[PDB]
Swiss-Prot record, chain A:
PROSITE patterns documented for this protein: EGF_3 (PS50026), PEROXIDASE_3 (PS50292)
Site (Aspirin-acetylated serine): S500
Gene3D superfamilies: Haem peroxidase domain superfamily, animal type, Laminin
Bilayer topology: Peripheral membrane protein
Further comment: The conversion of arachidonate to prostaglandin H2 is a 2 step reaction: a cyclooxygenase (COX) reaction which converts arachidonate to prostaglandin G2 (PGG2) and a peroxidase reaction in which PGG2 is reduced to prostaglandin H2 (PGH2). The cyclooxygenase reaction occurs in a hydrophobic channel in the core of the enzyme. The peroxidase reaction occurs at a heme-containing active site located near the protein surface. The nonsteroidal anti-inflammatory drugs (NSAIDs) binding site corresponds to the cyclooxygenase active site.
Protein's name according to its UniProt entry: Prostaglandin G/H synthase 2
Tissue: Following colon injury, expressed in the wound bed mesenchyme during the first phase of repair, probably by colonic mesenchymal stem cells (at protein level).
Family according to the record: Belongs to the prostaglandin G/H synthase family.
Cofactor needs: heme b
PTM annotation, UniProt: S-nitrosylation by NOS2 (iNOS) activates enzyme activity. S-nitrosylation may take place on different Cys residues in addition to Cys-510.
Quaternary structure (record): Homodimer.
Effect listed in the UniProt record for changing S549A: Decreases acetylation by SPHK1
Length: 552, 551
């Protein structure tokens, strides 16, 4: 006798509970629905469901009428009202305090309190269910190698029509790997990022012992070295900071930074160097305002400013670019001060899964007159030293990235990574694509052709999975029909955006007792946060101040 | 020296050095402006002219009983008053938290390191010219002289509110799940990383300790049976570490979640009662869900007991302490349309004000016996000799001591009281009057105003010389009590906001948790919402003796 909730019977965020070996009950508290399966809508619910516009209608409005948006963007009262709507509309979607995890399909103190887990937006399918997705489909899911090969692997390179470049692609990797840090000794549902958010541990280190080995202990600064007159991160041998390097890397090329894996990719070392310089620049600025401060307060206040700069850039440059909106997004914590909102966050497993954007990667990495293969590029920081940061920024600003949704664009060099995303999803017992769509208030797909918008890939998928209701989440995100001339389809935006909001606005520095000039050393440090940009980050820290952007 | 050492910024303004001898105050959202945030805005003037004082509000809540008997019996009205009670005291606690013993400015280290107690006021900087900043003498008075002159008990002073030994041991048992000072590191550090009501004193702080305490059948905790009665299991059987003198017999080395609870038979009484309650709730959930396994039975029982604890603490424990005629109510739904943060960090000063040593009697009176402190400490054979029924009947009848009002700390624990003074100073606490302003109370203008009498105030005046450098912890024990009450004003107005955040901030009070299905359905939900100190004893103690927190 299998678990009676295995068919996911309760709808509209109702919670399922076994009441016997072969019976269940649904808890409809505060869903706005009632009945055995929480499918009968209450009166006000009927009215609310007739005035709600679709995600695709709202997307259409924000990506047209540029003349009307140019008006709106220059009326501050109107701009804050719309940005307030953008923030609050996606609030109700994330459980906070968090609930489930890979080991707990019911709420428990272990799931609430153990920070080594990723949390879960949907609870896992129970261990004794008759099929992998519950009751639907066949006894085993299709071979992941067949899924990968038929609809995921890149044939010809498909460029992103939104114009994303390699500055964007490496910013994504650098930024997200402060909170996606899987503890593979324990398993794919466990994390080593116990801060669960934007704490900049990828610059300063996750533990105090690592931070102190990275710090200079003069003027608040981080340790550094000088090569050819340029400032780079220090070495492993000088700091005793542990890093992951193949055994053939020379000691002088073993750079030491907050995140142990950033020596793997020269694009990650580019941003690690930029942010190290930015920290020491802000220390210089704070010392001129506060000659009376000691090393500890200079260091700590610089870190808070850089956290604020990160959130500012991610909202007003990074998300702004991804969105495609004509409306100008705004980082303004005061918009939430009269709203109900929880200043806390727990990183969800499914946020990690949807962020596996590996179609972004090009076939070769083009710097100046060179075209490096994957094998030449990995673990080779000599390329950074040979070319320099100015040439990296100028080259990466010009090279187009790949399109993520729309199918068949994962580079063959990382085919094993893509296969692992499928296999670990199943290992963690994820529910199906259509279950996740309902969870985020989207209509379930009725066919594979509806999923993809074409015929050839959908027919491959139909032969593999047979029922659209057992299609898996992660391959679906990469084959989904994209928005018109966009990098993503609907499922990626509507799942990614609420997770992202909580991680940015949930930071304590956005709470009322923190969001004050004195928190950042007075008005001068505050203004650094509120004027930050990807362009100013590069201009202040890269020789020659080259122009840059997240688009080609 | 640091230019902020005089604490110049008022009304919750934040001070920042701007040079070697200059400061600026940040008045953001205080409702005041000006160099020291002392000039009120217009709306602030009107708000300040309607706010009644805490002593006026207390008078209202402890009189007019005929009016409160109507209020208490019309649910719409009762919830309206309780909603005001909760939201009035909200704006006082920083949440997310801010300062700690090592950081007088906000920092990512202070926010993220859970091994610190947080701080409601920042510490006095290390280079200030006097211990309290700039006022007073170069050294505070000798802590032994303060202790002896105004703290030590002469004759036993009973609590006029009628608090008993069931109350006093419940206070000790309950608070020592979240006051767990890490003396390896210092008085500003804690070992309770949950920072609240997680019942680690029953289940253990770590998973390794929890699994050693669990039976792994039917969700239950391990136990032993001595003379037909259920007690906690032994150290030798579970391999769980406890603090015991080496001379304790093997079967009296009880193992429970908190390593120090073998110290007092009164703490083992509650440890035994709560262990029985967990295994009782497992029995109930097993009959409701024959399909459930051991892991889900254990976890659901723990959530149910957390709710029982919060319910009892609000409606029996705080209800007794308050003295109010209005019946407080535990109802998370009252906050669902309010702004409120479901999180908590334990404050050092909350630990400090909770050192209620004067509650302890001169002897512990059980059946026909009167035990001294030396006979009572570490002696669980007393619990077995008399039994739990007799413990409850005796402790319900024995009066506790008055906490405020002076000269009532028993000599047997004089070293604990001294350490509270000394560690206050080590942690660089600001003064009584600074804490009073922080919680919107008028500063005291003389020692006589603080105590309401003459003899203690003159001793204090010769010792401290300036009322503005009087210290927080000794002041709470000499303060003039409310009329016929156990506490004075400072204790209630600092203690109540800390206490609210720790109870209502629990995740089980948030909307996504506060549902029947979280607790195994309606039968488990009802266990929380009907819990009482009387029913806790009635369900788990042979004979169902009557009990109460008052004599
Ligand atoms: C955000 C976009 C992004 C980019 C540009 C990127 C760029 C690259 C890149 C080229 C520079 C290479 C060779 C890799 C290769 C990897 N990536 Co990514 N990855 C990216 C997103 C991710 C995410 C998200 C994870 C999961 C991180 C984890 O949990 O620690 C990841 C994990 C990995 C892993 C380990 C997980 C596993 O396979 O189980 C490898 C290997 N990768 N990645
Ligand atoms: C809530 C009231 C209450 C009661 C009835 C009570 C009853 C008793 C009691 C009677 C049998 C004895 C011998 C003690 C003895 C002690 N108590 Co209390 N204590 C109480 C409140 C506290 C608090 C609060 C602390 C600090 C806890 C810590 O941080 O671990 C404490 C700590 C202690 C310590 C540790 C010293 C330190 O510096 O923290 C000793 C010893 N004690 N206590
Ligand atoms: C903390 C994580 C930040 C990185 C996540 C970035 C993108 C997630 C995926 C898709 C989002 C794409 C476009 C954003 C759409 C709307 C903006 C919502 C504003 C907010 O929600 O603020
Ligand atoms: C639910 C909280 C609402 C506050 C109730 C209103 C007034 C409080 C009345 C009396 C409290 C007396 C002293 C406070 C000192 C410590 C807090 C004890 C409760 C706890 O150990 O937590
Ligand atoms: C309980 C033992 C405390 C006495 C130790 C010496 C402290 C002397 O303290 C004195 O005690 C007198 C007797 O109570 C009081 O009348 C005086 O006001 C006080 O100064
Ligand atoms: C009232 C109602 O719609 N009940 C349905 C039942 O017909 C269906 O068999 C079950 C599937 O689990 O979901 C529920
Ligand atoms: C325990 C304590 O109070 N301070 C410690 C310090 O001794 C140690 O050097 C540092 C490194 O992690 O961690 C902290
Ligand atoms: C690391 C992991 O996945 N599970 C661990 C297990 O190894 C350990 O026995 C248990 C006791 O603390 O803690 C958890
Ligand atoms: C917390 O701070 C203490 C005191 O500096 C330090 O010893 C300890 O390592 C810190 N804890 C963490 C998790 O960094
Ligand atoms: C590493 O990069 C350098 C460019 O400085 C290049 O000359 C060399 O061939 C590369 N090594 C590998 C293994 O690709
Ligand atoms: C502010 O307070 C300081 C005390 O440090 C006092 O000297 C100064 O006069 C005050 N300024 C105003 C405007 O009240
Ligand atoms: C969290 O859970 C993991 C897996 O059970 C366990 O190994 C680890 O000890 C737990 N962490 C804590 C702090 O209990
Ligand atoms: C412990 O308690 C028992 C009463 O059960 C008493 O007879 C015995 O003398 C006590 N031992 C001490 C050291 O008080």
């Amino acid at each position: 006798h299998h678990h009676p909730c295995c068919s996911n019977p309760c709808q509209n965020r109702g919670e399922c509970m076994s009441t016997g070996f072969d019976q269940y009950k649904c808890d409809c508290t505060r869903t706005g629905f009632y009945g055995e399966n929480c499918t009968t809508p209450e009166f006000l619910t009927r009215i609310k469901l007739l005035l709600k516009p679709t995600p695709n209608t709202v997307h259409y409005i924000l990506t047209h009428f540029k003349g009307v948006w140019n008006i709106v963007n220059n009326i501050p009262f109107l701009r804050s009202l719309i940005m307030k709507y953008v923030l609050t509309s996606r609030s109700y979607l994330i459980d906070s305090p968090p609930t489930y995890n890979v080991h707990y399909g019911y709420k428990s103190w272990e799931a609430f309190s153990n920070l080594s887990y990723y949390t879960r937006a949907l609870p896992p399918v129970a261990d004794d269910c008759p099929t992998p997705m519950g009751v639907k489909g066949n006894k085993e899911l299709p071979d992941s190698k067949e899924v990968l090969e038929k609809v995921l692997l890149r044939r010809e390179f498909i460029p992103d029509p939104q114009g994303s470049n390699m500055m964007f692609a490496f910013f994504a990797q650098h930024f997200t790997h402060q909170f996606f840090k899987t503890d593979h000794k324990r398993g794919p549902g466990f994390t080593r990022g116990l801060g669960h958010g934007v704490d900049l541990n990828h610059i300063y280190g996750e533990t105090l012992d690592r931070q102190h080995k990275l710090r200079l202990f003069k003027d608040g600064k981080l340790k550094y070295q000088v090569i050819g007159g340029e400032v780079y991160p220090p070495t492993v041998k000088d700091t005793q900071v542990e890093m992951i390097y193949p055994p053939h890397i020379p000691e002088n090329l073993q750079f030491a930074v907050g995140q142990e894996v950033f020596g793997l990719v020269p694009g990650l070392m580019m941003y690690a160097t930029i942010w190290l310089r930015e920290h020491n620049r802000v220390c210089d600025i704070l010392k001129q305002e506060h000659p009376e401060w000691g090393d500890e307060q200079l260091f700590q206040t610089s870190r808070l400013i850089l956290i604020g700069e990160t959130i500012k850039i991610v909202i007003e440059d990074y998300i702004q670019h991804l969105s495609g909106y004509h409306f100008k997004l705004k980082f303004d914590p005061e918009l939430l001060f009269n709203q109900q909102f929880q200043y806390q966050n727990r990183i969800a497993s499914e946020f990690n899964t949807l962020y596996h954007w590996h179609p972004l990667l090009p076939d070769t990495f083009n710097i100046e007159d060179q075209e490096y293969s994957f094998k030449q590029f990995l673990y080779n920081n000599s390329i950074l030293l040979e070319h320099g940061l100015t040439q990296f920024v100028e080259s990466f600003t010009r090279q187009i990235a790949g399109r993520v949704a729309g199918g068949r664009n994962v580079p063959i060099a990382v085919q094993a990574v893509a296969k692992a995303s499928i296999d670990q999803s199943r290992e963690m017992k994820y529910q199906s694509l259509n279950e996740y769509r309902k969870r985020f208030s989207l209509k379930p797909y009725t066919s594979f052709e509806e999923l993809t918008g074409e015929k050839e890939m959908a027919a491959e998928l139909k032969a593999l999975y047979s029922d659209i209701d057992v299609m898996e989440l992660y391959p679906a995100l990469l084959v989904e029909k994209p928005r018109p001339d966009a990098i993503f389809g609907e499922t990626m935006v509507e799942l990614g955006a609420p997770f992202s909001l909580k991680g940015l606005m949930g930071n304590p520095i956005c709470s009322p007792q923190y969001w004050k000039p004195s928190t950042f050393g007075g008005e001068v440090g505050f203004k650094i946060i509120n004027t930050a940009s990807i362009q100013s980050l590069i201009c202040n820290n890269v020789k020659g101040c080259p122009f840059t952007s997240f688009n080609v």
